[PDB]
Amino acid sequence: SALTQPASVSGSPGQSITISCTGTSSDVGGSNYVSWYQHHPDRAPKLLIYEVTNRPSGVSNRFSGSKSANTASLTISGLQAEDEADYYCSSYTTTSTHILFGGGTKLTV
Amino acid sequence: QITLKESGPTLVKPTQTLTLTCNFSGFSLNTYGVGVGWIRQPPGKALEWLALIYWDGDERYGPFFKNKVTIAKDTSKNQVVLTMTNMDPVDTATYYCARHLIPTIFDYWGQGTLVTVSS
Amino acid sequence: QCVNLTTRTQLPPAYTNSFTRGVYYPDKVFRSSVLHSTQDLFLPFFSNVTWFHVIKRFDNPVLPFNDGVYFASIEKSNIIRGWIFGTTLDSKTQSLLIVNNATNVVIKVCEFQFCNDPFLDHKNNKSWMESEFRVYSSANNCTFEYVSQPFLMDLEGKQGNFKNLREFVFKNIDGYFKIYSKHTPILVREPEDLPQGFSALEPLVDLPIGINITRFQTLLASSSGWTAGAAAYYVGYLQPRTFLLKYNENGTITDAVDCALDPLSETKCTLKSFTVEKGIYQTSNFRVQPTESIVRFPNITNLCPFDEVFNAT
Amino acid sequence: VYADSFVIRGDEVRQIAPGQTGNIADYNYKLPDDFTGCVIAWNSNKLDSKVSGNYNYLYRLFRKSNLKPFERDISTEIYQAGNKPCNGVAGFNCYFPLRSYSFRPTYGVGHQPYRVVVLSFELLHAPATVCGPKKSTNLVKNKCVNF
Amino acid sequence: RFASVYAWNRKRISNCVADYSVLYNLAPFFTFKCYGVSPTKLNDLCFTNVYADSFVIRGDEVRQIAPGQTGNIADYNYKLPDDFTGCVIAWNSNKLDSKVSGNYNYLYRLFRKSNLKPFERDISTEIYQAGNKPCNGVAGFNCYFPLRSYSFRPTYGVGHQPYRVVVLSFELLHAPATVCGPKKSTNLVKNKCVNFNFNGLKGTGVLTESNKKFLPFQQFGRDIADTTDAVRDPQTLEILDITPC
Amino acid sequence: RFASVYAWNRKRISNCVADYSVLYNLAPFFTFKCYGVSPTKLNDLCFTNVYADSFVIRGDEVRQIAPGQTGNIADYNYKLPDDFTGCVIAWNSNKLDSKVSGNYNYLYRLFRKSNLKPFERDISTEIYQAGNKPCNGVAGFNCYFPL
Ligand SMILES: *[C@@H]1O[C@H](CO)[C@@H](O[C@@H]2O[C@H](CO)[C@@H](O)[C@H](O)[C@H]2NC(C)=O)[C@H](O)[C@H]1NC(C)=O
Ligand SMILES: *[C@@H]1O[C@H](CO)[C@@H](O)[C@H](O)[C@H]1NC(C)=O
Ligand SMILES: *[C@@H]1O[C@H](CO)[C@@H](O)[C@H](O)[C@H]1NC(C)=O
Ligand SMILES: *[C@@H]1O[C@H](CO)[C@@H](O)[C@H](O)[C@H]1NC(C)=O
Structure with a gap:
């Protein structure tokens, strides 16, 4: 669609x-x-x-979020082994009830 | 407590049509204010919303798949049935059935079933 | 630090009638040769002021406070050094402490944990000293402190021929603690009874305490078997009253008359005069008050069905 | 005491107060100038509104004259705007007396639905039925008391 | 020297008349914006007390003082409530606080178990356990020192400069007022009927001298008609009697 | 575009029929109170001269607009007479005027020799000095920029 999200x-x-x-x-x-x-x-x-x-x-409680002008930011504190996953954004839209976000995978070492 | 369970064939011939069922157990769908929808995710790419139905018999489908999909509910046996037509190899995906609310868009997702197209 | 003096020689409280005390300047205003009627918190005439005397004999217990007080100290050798005030005085509620022992005047409002019998004298020496100076053993949480210039005082331990009489009024206008003061020398009257005197009293200070206060104790100045000097102190109470005051040409109060004490004083007040002519005079209204109160309403419980109306789906 | 309930858009809640005019204060719900009791209103957007919109709510637009205060009955007969006689179906100069709402979560404030409850009652002229919570005491007699 | 952001100090100022003009008029103060009050009405506002908070923070973290702002400084180091009444002043402090080679005496906390309520101070620097396994002794796995010193030296770029931030806080009229604005006196009159306001009282009667003596407390006078006829001159302590023209 | 506070624009209206219902249509007109006339009776009155003034201020200084209040904006930039007739309308415009990067074309005065009577202008931007030292040229100590 017309919605994007960085993957990694x-x-x-x-x-x-x-x-x-x-x-x-x-x-x-x-x-x-x-x-x-x-x-x-x-x-x-x-x-x-x-x-x-x-x-x-x-x-x-380590989870946090913040909605900027055109973006939504997810922030994580005190990382452990459970971060290696894919995190999906999802927001209501006007012309359709779509989200269609790729999702964000996380890396750590 | 509510469990969302998906049931249906996994391998389908492209000319043949597809049927799927979600046997939600743990809420009465007739309660005023709760809906249920379908989300598919093809492998290698993002998810894709299909449709959703309301408690009071109000149905909303995807902008592209209005004719392709049809939805129906049976609160006596607490089930929902979805019909998909003229599917494609790109349409092969993992399918989920999910409770839907207004403040929280989607809360609890079923485990889902894989769907692939071949002979 | 404290000593359990105990052996309380607690005599029954003395009671005296207050003839003309309790008058001061209610306003910061100049008036010349005008009879002016005012209403305030006052001490009624011929009221039962409570008098304690200390001499073996030791009578200075805590006393209940209510809505402003009038303190009188009849002394010749500076026995009384301060005052205790408050509601509980037991390290949980803030409490007033005033001391003028040696150097300056000190006033604090704090929740002290006083001992059974704190004291300043009970000293072996006849001239004596402030034994057990810090009568309070702790100060939990308090920031209400001040120290200022001293007051006229005396020296040495002397008994009899009390030539000093200090009269203070401590009033509480909605937490505002106002201290007004006056002192009269050359008192030749015997300490047994209050003298026949009328004297104006002057305003000094206000302080923001704003705390629960309902009981008080005096502070004055080895303990087992000590004969102390004579110390006479009177405490009286105040309540809403209306008075009439006569100003002179100088601008000083020369006399005052009560309005709600006697019918003669009532008709004196209602004419804005001090003397009256022979005849009949109409006066205030006459009315009674209810003995109690009663209420009546339908006897049902049947809780109203509000919730389902608002919570309707 | 009796209560009245409905759902109105937040942009027109000001018309509830007596002495107002508008589409809903003239053809739907008119409140008398002398009014006792009061009204309670609050936003209901999580429940009533739907993602695809809600269309089961109706409101009158056209009426021949302003209605008297506290009118409840409704008639769904056809309305004719112009002088042309109108029967059967509507059309030119024939407007349907009612219209629907549309509620989306994407709408801004002043368009989300609101739930309104109105209270009204008379004051102490007849033997009262609804009463507040207070203890009852004994009935004393022949003595100066405060009843 | 100021206190640390996690160990800041608060001082009470009261029972005085504050001249906010000179503080506003001093050039190197940058932040001046008051939310619960007006930035120029500090000369006619009375409060029970004024609360001052002083500490040193980084320039990049100044904007987080506002209510509702979240950040490393705004969640672990320093906090404000959601109903803040007052205002803050911030300015550059790289000139004095920083040393020639970098002043490392300024530090801040990094690791904490949870988030504490606004205006709470802690000094302990015990290592925080990042992982689920408890750790004891010295620095090791899943736990390290929760404090890191600031790196503040003049050769650093824009935004690295330490900033001194001060906070003005006060309660709005729920106790006897102690802090009030200043007043100015202009001109004087003697024995003449003119329009003037004395100590909040308007008057046009001529002030005179008479045999009366005002006691050290007496300050005003009235007459039979219950109108003003005597006041204390604010300028000098002489006796006055007032009557119109 | 709406001009700054100190540069309020005055507009002329003459010889036309005025309907105030179209004013009521817009939602964010939540601040609408009038002194000399009741707001609901503007549709059956005639006037002799009308004036419209527009500008933008902070959210917390809108209350200061009403006549009588003393403050910065109401004593240095623009104020109304005590016997003023008419009223004000205000609404939020952060979607239009407010910017993520910051719109910095709106100014106002802080310093002036004295307060000014209602209904005139003040354009001169000569710096204001408070100290006795004669400050010339540009900003210095005890002589700041009025804007
Ligand atoms: C301040 O504190 C005192 C101490 O408790 C209060 O006195 C109480 O008054 C009530 C009035 O009915 C009595 O029932 C209690 O027994 C009193 N207390 C004690 C310990 O005897 C006083 O009311 C308080 N005043 C305010 C304004 O709070
Ligand atoms: C006096 O004796 C009592 C015992 O009833 C005790 O509680 C109190 O602490 C004693 N006084 C001092 C100063 O220790
Ligand atoms: C007042 O004091 C007198 C003696 O001074 C006493 O006889 C009388 O009973 C007292 N009355 C009250 C009410 O205290
Ligand atoms: C006071 O004298 C008594 C007996 O004369 C003695 O027991 C006591 O220790 C003395 N105290 C002081 C403080 O001198």
Whole structure:
């Protein structure tokens, strides 16, 4: 579609690292509804962000998010072995109810 | 607690049509304010939204697949049925059925099933 | 540090009638030769001021405070050094402490953990000293402190022929603690009874305490079997009252009359005069008050169905 | 005490107060000038609105005259704007008396649906039924009291 | 010398008249923007107390002082609430704080277990366990020293300069006022009927001298008609009697 | 474009029929109160001269616009007489005026010799001095830029 997301991000364990999902402001609209999911292989993804810098029950305080003008940034603090997964952005759009984000895989060493 | 389970054939001939079922167990779909939708992810690329249906019999399909897909629900047996037509090798994908809410777009996803096209 | 003096020679409280005390300057305003009616917190005339005397004999317990006080000290040798005030005085509520022992005047508001019988004298020497100076053993959390210039005082331990009489009023206007002061020398009256005197009293200070205060103790100045000097102190209370004051041409208060004490004083007040002519005079209204109060409402419980109306799907 | 409930767009909540005019304050819900009790309104966007929009909500646009305060009944007969007689189906000078809403999560404020409840009652003239919570005491007699 | 960002100090200033003009008029102050008050109405505002917070931070982290800002400085080092009332002033401090070869006396905390409430101070520097395994003794695996010294020297580029940030905080009229603005006196009159305001009271009656003596507390006077007829001259402590023309 | 505070633009309206319903249509007109007339009765009155002034200010200084209040913007830049007749309208425009990079074409005055009566202009940008030392040329100590 017309929505993009960088795929690969790298960092070091124990520190903080961030990734972003970017698109066009017109399609997403004024109202954001930024959302972020995580997916390790071999089982279904779940939700880690549903609202602006918001996380539901079953919390992991190392998670954080921030909605910029046209992007949504996900930041992780105190990395461990569970970061090696693919993280998907998802935002409401106007012309269609699409997200179509590639997702962000994470690297560490 | 709610489990979303997908059932259907995995290998399909391109001329033949496809049917799929999701037997959600753990919520009454008739509750006012809750929907359920379908998401597919072809291997090597991103996901792809298919369609979603509301509690009160309101149906929303994808902008491209309006004729290709059809959805129906049966709250007596707590199941949802989806029909896909004239699929393509590119259409081969892992399929998920998911609860849908307004504040939280998608919360709980089923484990999904692989779909491939061959003879 | 403290010593358990115990052996409390607690005599019954003395009670005296307050003839004309409790008058001061209510306003910071100049008035010349005008009879002016005012209402404030005042000490009614012929009220029962509570008097304690210390001489073996030692009578200085904590006393209950209520809505401003009038303190009188009749001394010749500077026995009384300060005051204790507050509500609980037990290291949990802030409490007023005023001391003028040696150097300056010190005032603190803090939650002290006072001992059973803190004291300043109880000293072997006849001239004596401030034994157990720090009567408070701790200061948990308090920042209400000040120190300022001293007041007129005396020296040595002397008994009898009290020639000094210090009268202070400590009033609490919504937490605002105002101290007004006055002192009269050359008192030849016997300490047994309050003298027949009328004197204006002057304003000094205000302080922002704003705390619960309902009981108080005096502070004055080896403990086992010591004969102390004579120390007479009176404490009286205040309540809302209305008075009339007579200014002179200089601008000083020369006399005052109560308005709600006696019918004669009432008709004196209602005419804006001090004397009256023979005849009949109409006066204030006459009314009674209810003995109690009652309420009545339908006896049902049947909680209203509000929740499902708002929580309707 | 009785309560009234409906769902109205947040852009027209100001018309609820007495003395206002507009599409909904003249043809849908008119409130009398003398009014006791009060109204409670709050945003309901997570529940009522739908991603594809909601169209089951209706509101009247056309009426022959302003309706008297506190009118509840509705008639779905055809409306004719012009002097041309109109029957059967609508069309030129014939407008359907009602219209629908559209609610998307992508809409800005002033368009998300709101849920409104209105309270009104009279004050202490008849034997009261609804009463507040307070303890009842004994009935004393022949003594100066505060009842 | 200022305190560290994680170990900052707060001082109480009260019972005084603050001249905010000179502080506003001093050139090298950059940040001046007040949210709960006006930047020039500090000369006519009275408060129970004024709370001052002083510390040294990096120039790149100055903008995070605002409420709702999140960051390394704004989550572990220093915090503000969501209903902040007051304003802050920030300026460059590379001229004095930094040394010739770099002043490393300024540090900040890096690793913490969680996030603490605004205006809480901690001094312990015990190693934080990044991993799930507990560690004891000295620096090792999954745990290291949670503090790293700043690298602040004049040869560093823009944004590396240490910045001295001060905070002005105060409560809005819920206790007897102690801090108030200054006032100015202009002109004087003697024994004449003119328009003037004395200590918040307007007056046009001629001030005179008479045998009366005002006591050290007496400050005002009235008459039979309950109108002003005597005040204390603010300029000099002489006795006055007032009556109109 | 809307001009700065100190350069408010004055507009002339004459010989035309005015409908105020179209004014009410826009949602963010949440600040609409009038003194001399009731806002709902503007559709049946006639005037002799009308004036419109436009500018942009901070969000927290909109309350200062009303007559009577003392402050910076209401004593140095633009103010209304005590017996003013008419009213003001304000609405949010961060979607238009506010910029991610920052729009820096809006200025205002902080320093002036004295306050000014309502309804005139002040364009001269000569620096303002507070100290007794005569400050000439450019900004120095006790002599700053008014803008
Ligand atoms: C300040 O504190 C005192 C100390 O408790 C309060 O005095 C209480 O007053 C109530 C009034 O009914 C009594 O029932 C309590 O027994 C009193 N306390 C004690 C220890 O006896 C006083 O009311 C407080 N005042 C304010 C304004 O809070
Ligand atoms: C006096 O004795 C009592 C015992 O009832 C004790 O609680 C108190 O601490 C003693 N006083 C001092 C100063 O130790
Ligand atoms: C007042 O004091 C007198 C003696 O001075 C006493 O006889 C009387 O009972 C007291 N009354 C009260 C109410 O204290
Ligand atoms: C006071 O005198 C008594 C007996 O004369 C003695 O027991 C006590 O220790 C003395 N105390 C001081 C402080 O001199």
